[PDB]
């Protein structure tokens, strides 16, 4: 319970809802928003002219 | 004491399994019942040779929902054919939940226990069954004396002493409360094995028929073309391979569901079919004329 903290997602098992594993992944539309847009491959050199 | 309070390992035939299952599933959702006819010997063996179903009820299985006039009528037939055997327990299907027992079914259980000292209850849940064997267990009453004076686990001794769970959650709950479960076994004589299996008359026709050739030009054409797309990616995987970690190899060049494993698999499986096809074709032409 020390390896747990309040407002930490946690996975459960069967219909007992016994704790299984800890979820350190948190699925949100905030995230999907960034996921379409990816990490961009515009570089500084292309904006070269003004440094 | 006067007893050994031990549960049998239950031998269910070929003849009984299919009857139990067919009636449970056609009849589900709706709890249904019927008796089990068998032979008792030893104290560790109980045979479920045959079974017969007893009519539907929507009030579930009760002692006040069974048809005894029907049971009597069947036993009258059973005597005229000369197949009479003693009742060895009873079977029922729950309609949608795992093997466990409700209170109402303990009341039904209790009176078979009185009639025949040792008797079993085989419970078939045919819609959590998918191997014809899973979510089917036998159960048997535990006495109230057995819990308080520790004469419950005399059935863990003088048997295999193993219990194989199909539902971990469901069995364990009634394992102390109101039943002890012991594992189920299957049997047949060799006459039965051969019958159950069958030998097909179309097994010999499909051997000696070479399929249409339109579907074969397509087969070779499609397969050889598809292996070009993944042949190329097999090079890119192994550009480096001297890098550590197996997951790592698959993350750099996108070797997820590996192109080595897939491409090989495709090579073995079209190869198996083409050898068999040239075999069948050459057999038919040389054989027939």
């Amino acid at each position: 319970v020390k390896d747990l903290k309040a407002s930490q997602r946690v996975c459960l098992r069967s219909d007992s809802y016994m704790l299984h594993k800890v979820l350190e992944n948190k699925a949100d539309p905030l995230v999907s928003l960034m996921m379409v847009e990816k990490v961009p491959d515009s570089t500084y050199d292309m904006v070269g002219g003004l440094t | 004491t006067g007893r050994d309070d031990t549960k049998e390992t239950v031998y269910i035939s070929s003849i009984a399994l299919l009857k139990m299952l067919k009636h449970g599933r056609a009849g589900v959702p709706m709890e249904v019942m019927g008796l089990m006819l068998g032979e008792f010997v030893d104290d560790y063996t109980v045979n479920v040779v045959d079974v017969f179903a007893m009519p539907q009820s929507g009030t579930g299985v009760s002692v006040e929902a069974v048809d005894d006039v029907f049971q009597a009528k069947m036993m009258d037939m059973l005597k005229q054919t000369g197949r009479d055997q003693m009742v060895v327990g009873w079977y029922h299907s729950h309609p949608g939940f795992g093997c466990w027992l409700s209170s109402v079914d303990v009341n039904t259980q209790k009176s078979f226990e009185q009639l025949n000292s040792r008797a079993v209850a085989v419970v078939v849940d045919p819609i959590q069954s998918v191997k014809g064997k899973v979510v089917i267990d036998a159960f048997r009453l535990i006495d109230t004396g057995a819990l308080i004076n520790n004469l419950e686990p005399r059935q863990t001794t003088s048997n295999t002493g193993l219990l194989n769970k199909a539902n971990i959650q469901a069995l364990i709950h009634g394992l102390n409360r109101h039943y002890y479960s012991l594992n189920i076994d299957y049997h047949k004589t060799a006459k039965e094995t051969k019958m159950l299996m069958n030998l097909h008359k179309e097994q010999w026709q499909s051997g000696l028929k070479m399929y249409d050739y339109e579907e074969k030009e397509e087969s070779n054409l499609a397969a050889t073309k598809s292996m070009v797309k993944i042949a190329e990616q097999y090079s890119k995987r192994i550009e480096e391979e001297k890098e550590l970690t197996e997951e790592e190899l698959k993350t750099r060049y996108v070797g997820r569901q590996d192109p080595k494993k897939h491409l090989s698999e495709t090579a073995d499986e079209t190869l198996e079919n083409n050898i068999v096809s040239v075999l069948t074709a050459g057999v038919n032409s040389v054989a027939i004329k």
């Binding site: - | 067919k22 191997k131 064997k133 069958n198 074969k216 190869l271």
Partner: protein, 304 residues
């Protein structure tokens, strides 16, 4: 009655029940357990769902003597309507081992109880044929081939056997063999080609023999057999035709592709070799490094 009946599928519950009944009435030595067959009919596919024994005797001295219980059928039909709604009398089984001409006479009486034409379903209790033991028949009437005598005789209906998905799971896993109803790898498919050809060989022999015994013994002529077997000769392939030449172009195409598939698998196993050859150099260096590194450790202990 019924004019829809092409095939009878049989579940393996029915085949086993009949088998049990023979051995639980104590009727053996070519005596007869006869029972009623239960399930849906009045369909192209007849499906037999269940079966139960009927009281039955026979005396092989005179086969115009047998015992069939008239009380028992009614009582069983009433009970059987309750368990499933599928179940109604759609014939009677015979326990074989052959089709006796004594089986017509029984079938004649049996028509009255039934709501269709009764079926004569032979289930053999000792296993036979490269094909199934189980062969189905329906009573029909027709003119002979001598153009004289309209005789009620028995029309073979072919069989393949089927079971619902309810029953089938329990069949597949109870079985603890290779199975002739499923198959594994290439190795099992070589087996299948030998077995399938062996069935042809045996079956051809029966046809020749039948032709012999017609012209020797002088059993009566059948234009049903002789007529069907007339077709076989025109269907027959021959050699030296343009058609066989088209087979050979296809045989080159299929073996060539099997050559390229084989070459591919040479590069695959040539890969595994490499991985091991890399694995061998890394393992041999680190294995030895450890020993050297341990000598120094031991050396600290010795010194003081």
């Amino acid at each position: 009655m019924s004019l829809q009946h092409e095939k009878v599928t049989i579940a393996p519950l029915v085949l086993l029940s009949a088998l049990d009944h023979y051995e639980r009435t104590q009727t053996k030595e070519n005596k007869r357990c006869v029972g009623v067959i239960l399930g849906d009919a009045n369909s192209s596919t007849i499906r037999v769902t269940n079966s139960f024994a009927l009281p039955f005797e026979e005396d092989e001295k005179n086969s115009d003597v047998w015992f069939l219980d008239h009380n028992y059928i009614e009582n069983m039909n009433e009970m059987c309507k309750k368990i499933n709604a599928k179940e109604k009398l759609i014939g009677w089984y015979h326990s074989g081992p052959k089709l006796r001409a004594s089986d017509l006479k029984i079938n004649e009486l049996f028509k009255k109880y039934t709501q269709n034409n009764p079926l004569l379903l032979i289930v053999d209790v000792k296993q036979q044929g490269v094909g199934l033991p189980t062969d189905a028949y329906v009573a029909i009437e027709q003119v002979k081939d001598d153009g004289t005598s309209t005789e009620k005789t028995f029309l073979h209906l072919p069989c393949t056997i089927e079971a619902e998905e309810a029953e089938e799971i329990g069949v597949e896993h109870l079985l603890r063999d290779v199975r002739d109803q499923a198959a594994g790898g290439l190795s099992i498919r070589l087996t299948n080609q030998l077995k399938s050809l062996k069935g042809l060989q045996s079956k051809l022999k029966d046809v020749v023999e039948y032709l012999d015994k017609v012209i020797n013994k002088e059993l009566p002529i059948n234009h049903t057999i002789l007529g069907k077997l007339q077709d076989v000769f025109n269907l027959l392939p021959n050699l030296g035709t343009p058609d066989d030449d088209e087979i050979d172009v296809e045989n080159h195409d299929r073996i060539n592709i099997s050559n390229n598939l084989q070459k591919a698998l040479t590069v695959k196993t040539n890969d595994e070799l490499m991985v091991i050859y890399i694995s061998n150099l890394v393992r041999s260096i680190i294995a030895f490094d450890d020993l050297i590194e341990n000598k120094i450790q031991n050396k600290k202990i010795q010194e003081q």
